[PDB]
Amino acid sequence: ILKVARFRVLKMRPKISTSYRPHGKWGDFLACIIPLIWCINILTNSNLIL
């Protein structure tokens, strides 16, 4: 937030985004580790109370 609130507006050092399209290295794999842990947690707890 700080960066986008302090250094991304036009008058404060914007960036020339020259990338046509994204090229990723296992994107979703990093974005799904945090949710999956949550799932595990929830599941385990439910089972115990069940």
């Binding site: 842990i37 595990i40 947690n41 385990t44």
Partner: peptide, 7 residues
């Protein structure tokens, strides 16, 4: 889970 309660 493993250490969810942390203590």
């Amino acid at each position: 889970a493993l250490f969810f309660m942390a203590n």
